[PDB]
Structure formats: C-alpha cells, structure tokens
Design a protein around this ligand. Structure first.
Ligand SMILES: O=C(O)CCc1c[nH]c2ccccc12
Ligand SMILES: O=C(O)CCc1c[nH]c2ccccc12
Lengths: 102, 102
C-alpha cells in the first residue's frame, strides 16, 4: 500500500538523500545548476514567494488579505504558510526573525 | 502588476536568490531540515526525493520505461521533462552527479 509505514520510510530516506546531495552541491558551488535541474521554474518562483510570506507573517504588519494582493497568492496558500510556520521549531523561528526582520 | 515584464522577472530573480542564500546559511547553521520542512509541502519533498532517483537511473541508463514507472511511479511525461532538464544541465554538474550518485 502507498500509505504503509515502509513506504513512508522509503520516502524519508529518498528525501534525506536529496538534502545531502544539495548540501554537498553548496560545498562544490553547484547548488544553482542542481536546483535548476531538480526544480521546475514555477517551483523556484513559489519558493521565492514563500520567503516573502514567511517574512511578512513574522513581521505581522500586513494582513493575510493584504498579503494575497501584493504577491498574487491565494488565501489558502497564506493559511498553509501560517500553519507551517506555527509548526516550525522554536530554534528555526528565532533564526528567521533575526534574518528577515533586521 | 503583470508577471510578464522585465521588472517582475528581475524581482523573481532576486526573490529566488534570497531563498538560495537563506538555505545556504541554514546548512551552515544545521537548520536546513526544519527550513525545508517549513518551505516545502510534503508532496513536494516526496517529488524531490523521486527526482533524484530519476536522475540516477537516467544517468545509469539501465532502467527501462516500464521499470521507471513501476519502481519510481514516474510516467512518461515526467521522465521526458527530467530528461530535458538533464540535457540542459552544464557538464560540470553532470560530471559531479555521475560521481556521487553512481
Ligand atoms: O500553496 C501551498 O500548498 C504551499 C503552502 C506553503 C507551505 N509552506 C509555506 C511557506 C510559506 C508560504 C506558504 C507555504
Ligand atoms: O513536472 C514534473 O513532473 C517535474 C519534471 C522535472 C523537473 N526536473 C526533474 C528532474 C528529474 C525528474 C523530473 C524532473
């Protein structure tokens, strides 16, 4: 079954292999061509927009509807971003607030 | 406001490079795994794990179309797009991938 625990374990090891591959691509200065190979153009654009969503949610000045109109993202996308930021570990959120809100 | 413009193409490039730099620092701070969990949906993370195996098998050249669809669940359209991306990749990236993946 595709929802089995053994399949979730295979997906996890495949994901960690990508993370390690990307880790060493940065060390070899090959991260830009590898990300161009592994991601579609729309996936790269979404990642850039999601950084802005994280920044504005952390800042708390703009409303979610306001966020939707400046970036062209739906309300559902904004809400899923807020869900993900809420579930993020404290150590990550603390670092993001120092980087994106300086 | 229209996404098809030289001004918006420049904005998309800066937003992408900002995520690239953010992820580079996360690797150096060992926050890459929670950052990637924050910025990607689980189905996107699963696809990236699968695309590594597609690249591996395309470079190896042994798996056939039925095997690629049976083992990786990748249809003909996905393999074709992955092949297109690999053909566009610079040699230096392809040299390195054949070393670390095989
Ligand atoms: O639209 C989606 O499905 C992606 C939602 C999403 C996941 N992580 C995110 C981080 C910031 C902004 C949005 C998101
Ligand atoms: O649309 C898709 O299915 C993703 C296509 C795609 C981009 N880079 C890839 C690398 C390996 C395999 C597939 C891909």
């Amino acid at each position: 079954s595709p929802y089995s625990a053994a399949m979730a374990e295979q997906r996890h090891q495949e994901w960690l292999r990508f993370v390690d591959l990307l880790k060493n691509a940065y060390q070899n200065d090959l991260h830009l061509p590898l990300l161009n190979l592994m991601l579609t153009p729309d996936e790269r654009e979404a990642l850039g927009t999601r950084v802005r969503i994280v920044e504005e949610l952390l800042r708390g000045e703009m409303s979610q509807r306001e966020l939707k109109n400046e970036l062209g993202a739906g309300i559902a996308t904004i809400t899923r971003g807020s869900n993900s930021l809420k579930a993020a570990p404290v150590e990550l959120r603390q670092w993001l607030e120092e980087v994106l809100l300086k």
